[PDB]
Design a protein around this nucleic acid. Structure first.
Ligand SMILES: [Mg+2]
Ligand SMILES: [Zn+2]
Lengths: 218, 122, 164, 37
RNA sequence: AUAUGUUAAGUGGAAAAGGAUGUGGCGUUGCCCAGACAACUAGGAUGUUGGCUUAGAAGCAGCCAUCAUUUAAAGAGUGCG
RNA sequence: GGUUUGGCACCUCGAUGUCGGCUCAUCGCAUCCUGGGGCUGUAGUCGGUCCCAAGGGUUGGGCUGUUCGCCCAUUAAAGCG
RNA sequence: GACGGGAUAAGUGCUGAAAGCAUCUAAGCAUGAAGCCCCCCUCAAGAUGAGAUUUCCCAACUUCGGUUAUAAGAUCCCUCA
């Protein structure tokens, strides 16, 4: 059991040894570090607190997240670590391992292993019904005027209210996502790069998050 | 992709030249088809002679599709036309010849009598 | 009343009771509304009234003290024969194996004071102290292939017969 | 089983009992298995 | 709250023909220690399907002629087929 | 039961717009398929009937304005409201 | 889409009386469906019961209560996805 962070950078091609073309995701686990170790003794759950991008030291008169407010620095000086931009946890891990304040290098992973992922989805604005939900559009000609709009909401003069679960134009994008049952292809420790079969919810340079699958079959 | 009310050529010794795709056997209301997918067709014209006639209705097995198939090696293929072949659930044809070359992925479906005849398995 | 034969000790504590014997020992509980004595080598049932329910608990509890007291000295047994072709059965390990034309064999595990006894490949028996346990287990076997109706190919108690 | 709101012993051996408030019968002949409700 | 019973169903806090070993009440009355009911073991008819029979059917196709005594005791069969 | 054809004339005449189809669905269960079961005049595969169960699914076309309906070809099933 | 487990309806039982027998049930014990729940994905402390953890800032004015411009921090402003 294990899990790391990373960054979607791009997708490519890569071949199996039977000649089967195999698509692939690229991800970068650069500068992963463990920061804090949240026991069940105090909090009520056993987990691992983590950090990914090196950022810089304390402000002087300074400004946004490129640099670091003191409390972050007060958290990263703690375990002999440089301050980090993205912090995330990982429950369901062998907390007996992972001393506070080390690295979670890609070598924990291995070719052939199965995984899930997590990440934000993509930017998408006020999208209509049929693009948000996939409803079916209406007729063009034969004189109509109902091309794309969401249809008749509800029932009648009775059942006056409109039920909550309906389907309407709102934003389509920002959502936590998970994609069970992907596989790993390769682990290049040189560039500290990993490769994941299939494709992941992310934009370029976005956040991506990984862990060992749960539905192995058990 | 091949679907309902789609007209095709043919390949065999039938006495027939083109057909119509009524239904595209599979599942619970498939719309589509590709190489390998058996279908239920009929006949909209005929050359003279031959066993089959106008107004008839029989099955067929698709081959020579115009939006070809992706092989798992990452290679593709494309013909120009669409076509089919007549069949009787021996999975062996009525006909005696096959013009118009064949797509090989039929082999997974265990069709070999028409693959005996086709220039060429491709 | 109830007998207390040789080497069968009797110790009662209100609702719970413990009784002892050669083939083992039991510890059952009863309804506390009942009442009890122990005469020297014999037993004295009580009920508090002629109420409806109390009659039930009276005759019942006779039956249960009888069950313990007979089980500890004698213990009980059940005869679950197999009849058919390809039917085979054998205690192997602490557990039982079976082979009945299913694509897979079967496993069964015991309890304390249980003994999956066998005479040979196609007949078995369990012998124990609690009549309850041995029969419950017996149906957990017999439920796996009930007696089919035409030929009788299947697990069965012995006297159980055929019904097309 | 034969579920019928009318219940009456169809033959001599059919013996009547109440199981869970409901009524049933037994005969050792399955084709006489009746439940009331 | 008081005294007295009933209900075991959320009846109360919607519904009929009809069905039932649910319980309670008021009565009629049979069998019961010259040892009842009930189950277990103990026996089951002798000739004889006996007449007329019915595929053979020998408690039994059923139309019944359906007697006595081996006898605790049993019917030209209580009965299961 | 209150889905039909009806009876009634209680709201509505200083306006409650009706058939059918498109998009949207939502619900009940007296279940059309899957799941589990009992019985069988169930040898097996296929079945008939009854019970629990409403979690999900319940198709394309021809024909008419069409509910309905007939038909073609599919399908595990092509539900009643 | 799972696997898997917990409790379950229909049903099958075990022991067993009321009712010496038989009895799946009233005392007791088990068993059993895509259903219920738990697990799976997501949102979510305005859950006014407003949570918990780590870290950071830390004066002078005697109104005593209180006031202050500032601290950490965030913003106004600007370049841009
Ligand atoms: Mg036309
Ligand atoms: Zn009967």
């Amino acid at each position: 059991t294990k899990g790391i962070l990373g960054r979607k950078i791009g997708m490519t091609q890569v071949f199996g040894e039977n000649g089967e073309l195999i698509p692939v995701t690229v991800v970068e686990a650069k500068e992963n570090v463990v920061l804090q170790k949240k026991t069940v003794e105090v909090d009520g759950y056993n987990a691992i607190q983590v950090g990914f991008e090196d950022k810089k030291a304390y402000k002087k008169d300074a400004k946004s997240n490129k640099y670091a407010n003191k409390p972050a620095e007060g958290h990263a000086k703690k375990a002999d670590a440089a301050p980090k931009r993205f912090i995330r946890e990982f429950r369901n891990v062998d907390v007996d391992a992972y001393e506070v304040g080390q690295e979670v290098s890609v070598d924990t992973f291995v070719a052939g292993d199965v995984i899930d992922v997590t990440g934000v989805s993509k930017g998408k604005g006020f999208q209509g019904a049929i693009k948000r939900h996939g409803q079916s559009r209406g007729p063009m000609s034969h004189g109509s005027h109902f091309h794309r709009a969401p249809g008749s909401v509800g029932m009648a003069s009775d059942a006056s209210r409109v039920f909550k679960g309906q389907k309407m134009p709102g934003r389509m994008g920002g959502n936590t996502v998970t994609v069970q049952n992907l596989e790993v292809v390769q682990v290049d420790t040189e560039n500290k790069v990993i490769l994941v079969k299939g494709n992941v919810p992310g934009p370029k340079k976005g956040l991506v998050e990984i862990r060992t699958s749960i539905k192995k079959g058990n | 992709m091949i679907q309902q009310e789609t007209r095709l050529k043919v390949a065999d010794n039938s006495g027939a030249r083109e057909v119509l795709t009524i239904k595209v056997l599979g599942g619970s209301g498939r719309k589509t088809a590709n190489i390998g997918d058996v279908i239920v067709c009929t006949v909209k014209n005929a050359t003279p002679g031959g066993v089959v006639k106008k107004g008839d209705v029989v099955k067929a097995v698709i081959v020579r599709t115009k939006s070809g198939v992706r092989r798992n090696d990452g290679s593709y293929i494309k013909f120009d036309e669409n076509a089919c072949v007549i069949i009787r659930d021996d999975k062996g044809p009525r006909g005696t010849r096959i013009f118009g070359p064949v797509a090989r992925e039929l082999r997974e479906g265990n069709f070999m009598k028409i693959v005996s005849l086709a220039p060429e398995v491709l | 009343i109830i007998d207390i034969p040789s080497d069968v000790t009797v110790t009662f504590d209100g609702n719970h009771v413990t009784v002892k014997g050669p083939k083992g020992e039991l510890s059952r509980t009863l309804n506390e509304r009942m009442t009890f004595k122990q005469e020297e080598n014999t037993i004295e049932v009580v009920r508090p009234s002629d109420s409806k329910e109390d009659r039930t608990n009276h005759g019942t509890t006779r039956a249960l003290l009888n069950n313990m007291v007979q089980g500890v000295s004698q213990g009980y047994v059940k005869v679950l024969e197999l009849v058919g072709v390809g039917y085979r059965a054998q205690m192997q390990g602490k557990d039982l194996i079976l082979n009945v034309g299913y694509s897979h064999p079967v496993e069964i595990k015991a309890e304390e004071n249980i003994t999956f006894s066998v005479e040979k490949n196609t007949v078995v028996k369990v012998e124990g102290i609690s009549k309850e346990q041995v029969g419950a287990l017996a149906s957990n076997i017999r439920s796996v292939r009930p007696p089919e109706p035409y030929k009788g190919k299947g697990i069965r108690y012995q006297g159980e017969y055929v019904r097309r | 089983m034969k579920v019928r709101p009318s219940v009456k012993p169809i033959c001599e051996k059919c013996k009547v009992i109440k199981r869970k408030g409901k009524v049933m019968v037994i005969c050792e002949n399955p084709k006489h298995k009746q439940r009331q409700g």
